[PDB]
């Protein structure tokens, strides 16, 4: 298979961190392309990341690419994971987009950035606290964790934007970020620029 990624596009984070789950089932080659390359035959506007499957079908959804990799590793779908993924797509993504746009394109700082996402971060923290398990949908790091980590990482990777009082979220985020596939994904996508790598994509 062929996985298309581009520098500083945040959706490439979770997919790179999850790609190892396909090992021993199928091969995932990484193709690095420009942010304006249109790799999907049926889509007018460029999309990255994109997975060209061995069948020649395409996955153009970051969460579906991650799901596919997990399913290859023998993961069983559960309702709680779906719930997180739907929330991430419809609720967190809009909030995070604004926050990162403020930070990166407008040069805003502190609460002028974090404001847009505080309620959403509080929700994740509260959910982690209320469950006894260290992960979002259970006892081991799974699909919901990688998708949510991947969305949040560009913001939360700078300790100044990881609110101190949200201790559950902090501990979860640390546990995820220290995993070797997460570190490598972070280094690949953001390189030396941290959140500023996003600037062309955010706009």
């Amino acid at each position: 298979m062929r996985l298309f990624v581009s520098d500083g596009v945040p959706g490439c984070l979770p997919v790179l961190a999850a790609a190892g789950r396909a090992r021993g089932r199928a091969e995932v080659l990484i193709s690095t392309v420009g942010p304006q390359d249109c790799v999907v035959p049926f889509l007018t506007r460029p999309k990255v990341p994109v997975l060209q499957l061995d069948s020649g079908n395409y996955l153009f959804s970051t969460s579906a690419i991650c799901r596919y990799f997990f399913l290859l590793s023998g993961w069983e779908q559960d309702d709680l994971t779906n719930q997180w993924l739907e929330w991430e797509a419809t609720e967190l993504q809009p909030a995070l987009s604004a926050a990162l746009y403020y930070l990166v394109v407008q040069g805003k700082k502190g609460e002028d950035v974090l404001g847009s996402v505080r309620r959403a971060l509080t929700h994740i923290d509260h959910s982690l606290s209320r469950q006894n398990c260290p992960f979002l949908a259970g006892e081991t790091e799974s699909l919901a964790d990688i998708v949510l980590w991947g969305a949040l990482y560009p913001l939360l990777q700078d300790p100044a934007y990881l609110p101190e009082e949200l201790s559950a979220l902090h501990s979860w985020f640390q546990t995820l970020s220290t995993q070797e596939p997460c570190q490598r994904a972070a280094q690949t996508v953001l390189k030396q620029q941290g959140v500023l790598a996003l600037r062309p994509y955010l706009q």
Binding site: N57, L59, Y68, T90
Partner: protein
Amino acid sequence: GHMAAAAELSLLEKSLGLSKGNKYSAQGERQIPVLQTNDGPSLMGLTTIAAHLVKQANKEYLLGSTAEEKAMVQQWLEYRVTQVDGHSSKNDIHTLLMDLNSYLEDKVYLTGYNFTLADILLYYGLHRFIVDLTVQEKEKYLNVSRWFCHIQHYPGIRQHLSSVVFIKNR
């Protein structure tokens, strides 16, 4: 705007042949659906609840039968809630239809030869646009028309929704 989620879920229960009951509450400004399952967790979100209902109906195959098919169903469910229910249909429905038209050129259903929950929800979600298409627009988006026609004839799916007229020009 789009079907309210409680209305869509009631329609999905009937399509699936669920008997049944299930009350939905709504949460937040966007009126997100919430299901309190008997002796189970609460579930939140249209597509999360939809996948749960398919399971209640003993129709798990509607979620896909392989890793690839399962991922593709979920990709098209996300497309439904983010693209069709989102800004892109409001601001540029024709680019969305052009892309779907290109995608469906060589496919019977969204994932291929198997009918899935993704066809059901994309049908429900697109109904408001397709019902309003002109004769010429249905001819332009020929592959969308053909897929939509298959779904509107698929057993149990249409329910109360208006039939759309399609005329092959071949």
